[PDB]
Amino acid sequence: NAFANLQKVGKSLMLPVSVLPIAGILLGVGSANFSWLPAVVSHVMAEAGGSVFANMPLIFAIGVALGFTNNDGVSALAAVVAYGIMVKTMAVVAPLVLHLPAEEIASKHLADTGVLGGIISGAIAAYMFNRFYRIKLPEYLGFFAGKRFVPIISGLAAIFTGVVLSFIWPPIGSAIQTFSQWAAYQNPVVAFGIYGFIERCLVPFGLHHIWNVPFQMQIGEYTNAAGQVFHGDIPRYMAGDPTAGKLSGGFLFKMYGLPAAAIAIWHSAKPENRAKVGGIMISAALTSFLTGITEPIEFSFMFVAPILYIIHAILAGLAFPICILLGMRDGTSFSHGLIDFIVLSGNSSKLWLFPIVGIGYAIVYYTIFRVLIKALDLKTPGR
């Protein structure tokens, strides 16, 4: 059941992403320094959003623990304990292993685990909960027995894992740093084209959350004037990173093409199966256009027309290079929709080109889908 196990990783890694909108509303608006809001309000909102982003590794740990424990809050408490213990164990052991000052390591994040550390801590907590949450102790130790024993063993395992990972990290950490530097600053064009293609390829099976975690949460490192450091395209754009927003190509298809593809599916639908198909597809198009959720649109032609899905994946992969080359920069919280498009427009660049290239993308999607449905006789909804 490896395939199902991988899915639970995707769902568990999605939950930390679902709480980004509150960070986007606060940090996105606050960092924009809108003239129609007092500076105090913007500063407070920015600080609140930065607080939300400072706990992202802990939120990931909680997500993993809840995903692998049927959403039990004691597992979340164990994840908190284990994440704290592991982070402090690594921070105190790594200077000894590397024989370098702790301050330099912290500043350069040589031993920093971040989201991966949160995932490891949450996995430890989930395993300890699943094994020991029914542990029977001697009658005179019955108090610590059960869910009460989970945090203690989780913390012990956490300190052990902290020592082990303080020994193990340097190589994998250097590899991760090199990959992040490449994909963020050296060749972001091909990097994010591949990201888009692989994400569309993985969306059918739920692994796109796993594939997104690096690009959305880890690659890149931006520090604001307050000294807080952000990792990933999403937090870095919300924080106000001029180099972020490389995921802006999501808008081009999510808000224009997939809705245009749905419109094409509606039009190509038979008249006897046209009204209901149009209702379903307009609902899906509105969903993808406002929130950015593509699954109602993509699942319609995911299996019946694999050729259409491959063409969509290629176009989506090309969307990100198009925006990067054209300078179109606008970020999202969870998925690329109109709400995120407007709320997060404060730090955007060339926001006017988005409707233009979007109309182009809609025309391309509509024409391609209509032509290939007529030619290849693809059985899109309503057939």
Add this chain to the structure above:
Amino acid sequence: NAFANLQKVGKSLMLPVSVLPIAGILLGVGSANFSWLPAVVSHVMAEAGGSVFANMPLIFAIGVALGFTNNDGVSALAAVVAYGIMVKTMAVVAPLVLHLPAEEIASKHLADTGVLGGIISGAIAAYMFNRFYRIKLPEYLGFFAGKRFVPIISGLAAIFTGVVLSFIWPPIGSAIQTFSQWAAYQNPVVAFGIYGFIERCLVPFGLHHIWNVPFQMQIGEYTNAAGQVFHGDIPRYMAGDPTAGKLSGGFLFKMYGLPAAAIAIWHSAKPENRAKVGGIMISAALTSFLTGITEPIEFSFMFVAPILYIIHAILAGLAFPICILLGMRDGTSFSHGLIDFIVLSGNSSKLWLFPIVGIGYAIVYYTIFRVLIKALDLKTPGR
């Protein structure tokens, strides 16, 4: 149902306490600087325990949220978000309200909420979960609907509450600071005598957790060489505070008298109801002697012999002044037992007097219970 509501507060405030043993094992041993352990091991364990104690307000928020949401992990995630948002909102607004530098406020903790802030955040998260965890949104916004909407509204409410409390705190905070200073440094004798008496009076109904939260977690302020600041007798003793350990009077009755009271109950039991009574009471005595859990012993004579319970409460209240005056200093993690007595003995003082005064307390309890059962015909277990 106010009485039941108060109970849920006690249970919810107990859960943060139940994860103290891992802090006690690590911080208690690590801070002791035992010669039979390498300095590196002790330092690592101390840092891990300090990490556990740094998140105590967050652990309290999670406890409240889980207690008032039937232990749902999404409520814990909402509590994390809300606690972070509220803490940074207060830290950024209070300097404006008080017109004082933020650094001075943070150092002196003038606007610090701590455990109370965690409780407030957890209450916000629990209320928002209970109200909105079934919220129905427009079909095109269905993604944010449900448990996904709880963290966003919880964070908004958290920032609003942060502003309100940054306005409201100074008076109540000054009152709390004065009470803590008094009970910790000015008249700890009467303070902890009253604490013991009221704790024994509230144990029957579960409010003793609420009554303990201030003394255990808030009164006092100790900072170690690492710069971490601890609040409450328990963390301060674990950290190595010479002035802490005022709860050491718990041992005198929990490990000696209540077990001695159980032995007296066994002896006074009728021969036909003596073997099983002795088994039950020896199990209870072992529980209270090792872990410190008094409920098995106290509930035996709680209702049948209210006079005995009142005498026990008075003796327990006198226990803490006795230790304070005699200098007997030894701390606990959750309750006063032999495991905590040994593990946390590294920072103890006059550990030799504990068995002596304990034998005295056992003699007193045994004599009093036997005499009053023979005289007043109190129907202790086995009658």
